[PDB]
Amino acid sequence: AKQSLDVSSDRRKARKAYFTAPSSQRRVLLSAPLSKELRAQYGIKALPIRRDDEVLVVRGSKKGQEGKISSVYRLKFAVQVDKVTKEKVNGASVPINLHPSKLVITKLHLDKDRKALIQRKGGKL
Amino acid sequence: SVRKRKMNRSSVGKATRRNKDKQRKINIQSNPIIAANWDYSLTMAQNYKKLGLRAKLQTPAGGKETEVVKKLEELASRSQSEREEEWLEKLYKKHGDDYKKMFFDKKLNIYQQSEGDLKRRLLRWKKRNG
Amino acid sequence: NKLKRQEIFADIKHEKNKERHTMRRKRAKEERENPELREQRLKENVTQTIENTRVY
Amino acid sequence: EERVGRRAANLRVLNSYWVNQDSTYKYFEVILVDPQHKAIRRDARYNWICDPVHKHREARGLTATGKKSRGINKGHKFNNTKAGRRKTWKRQNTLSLWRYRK
Amino acid sequence: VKVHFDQAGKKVSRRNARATRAAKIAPRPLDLLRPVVRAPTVKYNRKVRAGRGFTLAEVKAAGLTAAYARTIGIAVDHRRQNRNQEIFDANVQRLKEYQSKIIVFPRN
Amino acid sequence: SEKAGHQTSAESWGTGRAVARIPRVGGGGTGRSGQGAFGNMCRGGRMFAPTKTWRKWNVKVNHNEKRYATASAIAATAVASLVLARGHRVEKIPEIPLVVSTDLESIQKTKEAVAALKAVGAHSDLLKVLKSKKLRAGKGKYRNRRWTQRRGPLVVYAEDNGIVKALRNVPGVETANVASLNLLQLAPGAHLGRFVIWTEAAFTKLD
Amino acid sequence: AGVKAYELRTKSKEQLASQLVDLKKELAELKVQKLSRPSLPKIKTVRKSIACVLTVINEQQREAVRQLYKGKKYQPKDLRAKKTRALRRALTKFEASQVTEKQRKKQIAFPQRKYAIKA
Amino acid sequence: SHTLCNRCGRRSFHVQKKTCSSCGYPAAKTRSYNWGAKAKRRHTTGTGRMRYLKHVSRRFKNGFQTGSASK
RNA sequence: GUUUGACCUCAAAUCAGGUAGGAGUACCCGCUGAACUUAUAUCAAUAAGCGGAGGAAAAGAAACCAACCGGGAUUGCCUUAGUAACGCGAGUGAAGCGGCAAAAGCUCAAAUUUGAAAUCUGGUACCUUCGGUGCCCGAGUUGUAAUUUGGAGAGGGCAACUUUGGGGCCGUUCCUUGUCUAUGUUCCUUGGAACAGGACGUCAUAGAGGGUGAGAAUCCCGUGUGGCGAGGAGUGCGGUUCUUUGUAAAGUGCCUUCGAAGAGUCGAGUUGUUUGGGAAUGCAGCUCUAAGUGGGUGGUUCCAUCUAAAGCUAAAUAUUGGCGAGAGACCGAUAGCGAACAAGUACAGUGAUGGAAAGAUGAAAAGAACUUUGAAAAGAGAGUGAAAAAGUACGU
RNA sequence: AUGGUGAA
RNA sequence: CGUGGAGGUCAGUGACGAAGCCUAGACCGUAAGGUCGGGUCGAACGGCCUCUAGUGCAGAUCUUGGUGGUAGUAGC
Ligand SMILES: [Zn+2]
């Protein structure tokens, strides 16, 4: 149960905020958990997902499929993973949208900012 | 409200503020001893009763020395100008201690001060000198 | 807007169908002039029936 | 006071007094203070007039003559008009109701 | 028609204001010291109620001056007169008790 | 809204036009012209007897009657059969009324509190909650009333030392003081015999 | 790519003017060739570069104006603050806090005291 | 009969009277009446652009701060 | 001196430093103001119109209320009370006392600084710039500097009287703002998709809430408690301090000498307005117009209270407008603001103005590849999708 | 009734 | 008897199908109505004690919306 008076437990307000959230906030929204093998290494459960990261699908019809993220579709609240595509009847290949919460990160693309965030979040490297 | 609808539709962004929590949360900032002993969980009247300080001198409306010694502990815890000192020196080594004569000293007593004021100033000067 | 979406796509469908009809008529005329083009197109285009797309 | 204030918008009306009269006209002398002047602004005894609440005092009848014309005084002589002739209508025409009816 | 839907809200606001005043005014008891006054109008001539402030004579008898008394949170009334020598005695005793029960911090 | 309905501008055509005398909107070209208004029978018109804010919401209740109701509700908690008829799973409680040692009020962690409650035969009552959780039925799903659940055991304490915060999160379980003893909590839905887990200090202070 | 503001911050007025002229000439040439190609994204880049150069030049001019107006009061209104019309007037802090001699003497003689009422 | 009004361009400028029947041009005070609630709403602040009034609330929240960040 | 300069007045400057217009308008402060509606009374000191500011506005510390053992700024609630009072019908309709919320009192005029216009606006050079100093000029003596408002107050003498200001730094308070802070996605069944049922684990000062292919505590975002920062407001206060300044200032008791209070103003007269107000009090035009042991307000042949004709003040008070937040036993696309969507938009009016209809595919367009009949529109095969008995004329 | 619009 | 919502209650029902709709289906009650059989449908709703009302339509030359006879007629 909430205790702060500055937070509203209103379904309408939450729905309005989620759909109208900006890209910067959507980056925090589009967070995915880390594989337990990586959790023991970096000591962190979830991190923001970016294009260079490699993720594994654990839910949906494409369970057991892993690949690199081709792009992060923040507008549609979904991400695209390499080798996960829907073959159209015309022979064209279209990536299948996937929510980050349904994907498990197998590898992380290291950077100065990523390392700083990991250190800030209590992780180790 | 036309303005409210335009602001919501506009992409400028509402100047969001959040201060409801701070309305209930009040920090005591008028005494160091009380601040270290004040309990925000208890009410103002409850805190005053706990510390022993009276909250309302009059009878409160409706129904209803642990730390006071600290205040008592802390409870128990001029000069003359150079020109004034020089003038008093002239009064001294012109008349000495005869304030009655000094009262009529036109040259030295430029201001016709009373005998009492002159004697008080002389005593103050002496207390800081020989 | 529902009205905008309905109106915009209604015109698009008409134009697309008209263009397809004109292209098909021109292609039929050219095939009548040059029947070989029909064979060339058929050699590369398949109806992709469910039976033809068996997954072994 | 209103006439002098309207022309001298930048000035603030403080008070007024009678000086002369005529069969066809009556003359009054009005005193005004310029809040913009730094002397008044830095004068504690008179810097209060610079407050925006005191803008166009004569228009709202906050002057000595305006207050007198409003019948604002202490005594039974002004009980029915102690606090204006308009707020009384709202006071008497408003039905006060509480959460728990009395 | 006016309905007081903010009775609880008004009470909460008043309580918060009192708490804020106490936080700003930690040592003093959120108010001054008031005298004991007998109500008029016969029907209430036998009722004693708190007054506005002590008279100048009462403050002088208490052993302190009005100017200094006001700084110690003592209400002083310059228009109230003393005519019965029992409320005056009660007020003097109350002022003496207040003086005995007050602890004053130094300027520095 | 008071302005509802009256915003539209309309007038009554009257007799001689062979049409209903309901006021109709003026103008033309917009389609709204000639449409009836100013009536509860008209689309978009003022509703008959519009609801007003000054409707009697709160109800005054005699203090003695409130005290009597609270006393009756408290007394109903000491009857196992009555409490069972209330729907609480008190079939395996060591005794009724249930009194626990004063050390219960000093529990801080929720795990310890729930373990203690389970150890005293309240496990069935706790399990009753979190299993009946069902979505709100009707239009209340989208009015901050989505979820409803059965009431859990009530814990009464003489003084608070962390039990109120410890048991706040566990669903169904509610905490109250002996001084208040809210009637609504004691007898939810005007029903007697709620399962109450008392404490030695609370039991002594009830006298 | 495009120019950067910090790079231009280290260039003199004449160099900035020459760069602005060159960028304007390039923009004009691109516009003359706009119909030559279906779409040239470099037009937006050169426009942004021109805007940045103009902003840098304006900032330099404003800083020079401020420097030449240093010290003296009643500076040009443009260089002044833009809080709002109401706050500009109405008894700035020094005027508001002014206290007459009598009030100051009374406050010094009888300042508010801190006290507690238990003993 | 009527011409575009410079102040509002409502096409309510009376040529004969050389005045606008909507905004009252060239009257100093914009025409508006309490009984015309719909008319007031049609011209209430916010219907236009509010070039400067929009950011007043945002600026106030910052205390009308002047200067630049410190990085 | 047939002449010069001052005082006073009147004008010009695209001179320097300043301000008012308007918009908005729920609340406030003044002017003005009708009819429907009901038997001068009453709608009604209302609607509309006009002028003026704010976050509140007005009022505010008695020429008060009272006849009591007297109370002691204004303000709002209950009560007084549907009483007094008016109209004596219809009806209108208050206030003292009492309880509650909050309480802060002050600023001028009036008596000589005259052993020193000691005051202040403006320009200039600097500095530690919401300002300070030096110089210059001007305003002022037809009064700017000290003190005082009867609660008095002032000039002197005596206490073996008592007391004392200014500016930075860090902390502390507040505003803005970034960030950290727990636990399964284990097994079986079904389902397009598990967020569905059963079994087995874990956190809970964290089971408010939202998203993820259908009801998710343990997938994520989030919530509970605490931690780490950065930029601003401020003297509310604890240290650190640099300065103090000078026969300088203030407070108490005693002794002596003085000791000043608002005029075309009250009031009477007369003509209009206001109230349900019987002593039209109150407000509005005008003939007239006073005293200082005085005058006003009252009850009894005397007594009770105050000191009007000057002004300031935060608090409790109102709020259908604005900014920003927390909620509903409220409505749910013929409902709810006229407007859930290109809504004050289309549209109509020479114009003041009036003013609607319109929500939902599918999880993902994967929006029907390709063949073919077809002036153009639609079909027949074929195909994706759980569903085309979901075809962008799409939730049923 | 109030506030405005037009006009052989 | 029936409906909008609320407190309680069935550790209720439900993607192995909740609501609604259709039904030349049956059952129960004198009736208001309730239950079940079969088809479409897809994600909420119900058994019972109370509270609550913007709570029940055959008309008001009723309002909003949709569709017919006149009629493929007068007419262009
Ligand atoms: Zn115009």
Q: What is the DSSP string of A5-66?
A: TTS---HHHHHHHHHH--HHHHHHHSEEEBPHHHHHHH--SEEE--TT-EEEE-SSTTTT-E
CA angle G3, G6, G9 (to 5 degrees): 105
Structure tokens given for A94: 């279209």
Alpha helices by DSSP H, listed for chain G, are 5-9, 13-32, 42-68, 85-88, 93-97, 101-109
What is the DSSP pairing of strand D96-97 with strand E48-50?
Answer: unpaired
Question: Chain A residue with minimal CA distance to F165?
Answer: A1
CA dihedral (B3, B9, B11, B13) positive or negative: positive
User: How many of the other CB atoms lie within 10 Å of CB of D4?
Assistant: 16
Chain E CB within 8 Å of residue F1 CB: no
Structure tokens given for H29: 């005070």
Region of residue F206 (phi > 0: left; psi between -120 and 50: alpha; otherwise: beta): alpha
Q: For residue A93, what are the β-bridge partners?
A: A87
Structure tokens given for F34: 């000639």
* H20 labeled binding residue: yes
Alpha-carbon distance of F38 to B55, in angstroms, equals 60
Residue F11 belongs to what H/E stretch?
A: strand F10-11
Question: E5: which chain F residues are within 8 Å (Cβ-Cβ)?
Answer: 53
Residue E48, φ and ψ in degrees, nearest 5: -110, 130
Residue D17, φ and ψ in degrees, nearest 5: -150, 160
CB F1, CB F14: distance < 8 Å? no
Question: F60: which chain D residues are within 8 Å (Cβ-Cβ)?
Answer: 100-101
Alpha-carbon distance of F54 to D99, in angstroms, equals 9
What residue spans define the domains of chain G? Answer: 1-73, 74-119
CB F72, CB F190: distance < 8 Å? no
CA angle H50, H52, H55 (to 5 degrees): 100
Alpha-carbon distance of F196 to F99, in angstroms, equals 9
Alpha-carbon distance of A88 to D80, in angstroms, equals 88
Alpha-carbon distance of F175 to F198, in angstroms, equals 10
CB F60, CB F66: distance < 8 Å? no
Alpha-carbon distance of H50 to H40, in angstroms, equals 17
Q: How far is CA E21 from the centre of its chain?
A: 17
F72-to-A6, F152, F158, F181, F194 alpha-carbon distances in Å: 39, 20, 20, 12, 12
Is H32 in a helix, a strand, or coil?
Answer: coil
Residue indicated by tokens 């109500």: E39
Residue B91, φ and ψ in degrees, nearest 5: -60, -45
Question: D97: which chain E residues are within 8 Å (Cβ-Cβ)?
Answer: 1-4
Burial of A61 (0-12, 13-18, 19+ CB in 10 A): exposed
Burial of H17 (0-12, 13-18, 19+ CB in 10 A): exposed
Residue F114, φ and ψ in degrees, nearest 5: -70, -35
Structure tokens given for F86: 């209330």
- Would you list the DSSP string of B39-74? -SSS-HHHHHHHHT--S-SSPPSS---TTHHHHHHH
Is residue H34's beta carbon less than 7 angstroms from any atom in nucleic acid strand J? no
CA angle B106, B112, B113 (to 5 degrees): 130
Cis amide leading into E35 (omega within 30):
no
Alpha-carbon distance of G20 to G52, in angstroms, equals 9
CATH class of G74-119: special
Q: For residue F197, what are the β-bridge partners?
A: F98, F155
In whole angstroms, I215 C1' to E5 CA is: 37
CB H64, CB G81: distance < 8 Å? yes
Nearest Cα of chain G lies from the Cα of H35 at a distance, in angstroms, of 31
Burial of H35 (0-12, 13-18, 19+ CB in 10 A): exposed
CB H27, CB H8: distance < 8 Å? no
- Would you list the DSSP string of E59-108? HHHTTS-HHHHHHTTB-B-SS----STTHHHHHHHHHHHHHHHEEE----
Q: What is the tally of structural domains in chain E?
A: 1
A18-to-A9, A76, B10, B31, B74 alpha-carbon distances in Å: 14, 12, 17, 45, 57
Alpha-carbon distance of B120 to B91, in angstroms, equals 13
Between helix B44-51 and helix E7-24 the angle, nearest 10°, is: 40
Alpha-carbon distance of E87 to E75, in angstroms, equals 16
In whole angstroms, I107 C1' to A84 CA is: 84
Is residue F111's beta carbon less than 7 angstroms from any atom in nucleic acid strand K? no
Mutation for G interface: E30, E65, E71, E95, most G CBs within 10 A: E71
Q: What is the dihedral of CA G24, G29, G34, G38, to 10 degrees?
A: -110
CB E23, CB B30: distance < 8 Å? yes
Chain G CB within 8 Å of residue E98 CB: yes
Residue count (chain D):
102
Alpha helices by DSSP H, listed for chain B, are 2-9, 20-24, 32-37, 44-51, 68-76, 82-95, 99-103, 115-127
Structure tokens given for E80: 């109230």
Chain E CB within 8 Å of residue B23 CB: yes
In whole angstroms, K29 C1' to F137 CA is: 29
Between helix B82-95 and helix B115-127 the angle, nearest 10°, is: 110
Resolution rounded to one decimal, in angstroms? 3.5
A98-to-A31, A66, A71, A109, G1 alpha-carbon distances in Å: 12, 12, 11, 19, 33
Burial of D97 (0-12, 13-18, 19+ CB in 10 A): middle
* H57 labeled binding residue: no
Nearest by CB to H57, from B5, B6, B15: name it.
B15
Alpha-carbon distance of B105 to B115, in angstroms, equals 11
Alpha carbons within 13 A on the beta-carbon side of H57:
12
What residue spans define the domains of chain A? Answer: 1-125
Nearest Cα of chain D lies from the Cα of G117 at a distance, in angstroms, of 36
Alpha helices by DSSP H, listed for chain D, are 2-7, 38-41, 64-69, 87-93
List Cβ<8 Å contacts ≥24 apart for F157-162: F157/F104, F157/F105, F157/F199, F157/F201, F157/F202, F158/F102, F158/F105, F158/F199, F158/F201, F158/F202, F158/F204, F158/F205, F159/F105, F159/F201, F160/F105, F161/F105, F161/F106, F162/F105, F162/F106, F162/F107, F162/F108
Alpha carbons within 13 A on the beta-carbon side of D83:
5
F123-to-F90, F116, F163, F182 alpha-carbon distances in Å: 9, 9, 17, 24
Q: Side chain identity at E12, as an amino acid letter?
A: V
| Whether D99 and E2 lie within 8 Å, measured CB to CB | no
CA dihedral (E53, E54, E60, E64) positive or negative: negative
Q: For residue G56, what are the β-bridge partners?
A: none
Alpha-carbon distance of F151 to E4, in angstroms, equals 33
User: How many of the other CB atoms lie within 10 Å of CB of F100?
Assistant: 21
D47-to-B122, D12, E96, F159, G105 alpha-carbon distances in Å: 46, 12, 42, 58, 19
* Chains in contact with chain A (at least 3 beta-carbon pairs closer than 8 A): B, F
Q: For residue A71, what are the β-bridge partners?
A: A80
F187-to-A26, F69, F85, F147, F190 alpha-carbon distances in Å: 46, 9, 13, 21, 6
Cis amide leading into H26 (omega within 30):
yes
User: How many of the other CB atoms lie within 10 Å of CB of F174?
Assistant: 19
Is residue F190's beta carbon less than 7 angstroms from any atom in nucleic acid strand K? yes
What is the DSSP pairing of strand A78-81 with strand A85-87?
Answer: unpaired
Closest CA to H44 of F50, B5, B49: B5
Q: For residue C30, what are the β-bridge partners?
A: none
Closest CA to F129 of F87, F171, F67: F171
Alpha-carbon distance of D3 to D13, in angstroms, equals 11
Nearest Cα of chain H lies from the Cα of B23 at a distance, in angstroms, of 18
Is A78 in a helix, a strand, or coil?
Answer: strand
Alpha-carbon distance of H7 to G111, in angstroms, equals 60
Question: Strand I: which of residues 4-63 in chain H lie with Cβ below 7 A?
Answer: 10-12, 21-22, 28-30, 32-36, 38-45, 47, 57, 61-63
- Could you say which residues from 40 to 69 on chain E have a Cβ atom under 8 Å away from some Cβ of chain G? 67-68
CB D57, CB D13: distance < 8 Å? yes
Alpha-carbon distance of B91 to B102, in angstroms, equals 7
Residue indicated by tokens 């020395």: B65
User: How many of the other CB atoms lie within 10 Å of CB of C22?
Assistant: 10
Alpha-carbon distance of F173 to F153, in angstroms, equals 5
**CATH 3.40.109.10 for the A1-125 domain, yes or no:** no
Is F2 in a helix, a strand, or coil?
Answer: coil
Residue A48, φ and ψ in degrees, nearest 5: -60, 145
What's the N-to-C CA distance of chain F in angstroms? 52
Closest CA to H44 of B6, F3, B12, G86: B6
Range of the domain at E80: 1-106
CB A82, CB A54: distance < 8 Å? no
Closest CA to B51 of B78, B74, B77, B71: B71
Question: Chain F residue with minimal CA distance to D99?
Answer: F58
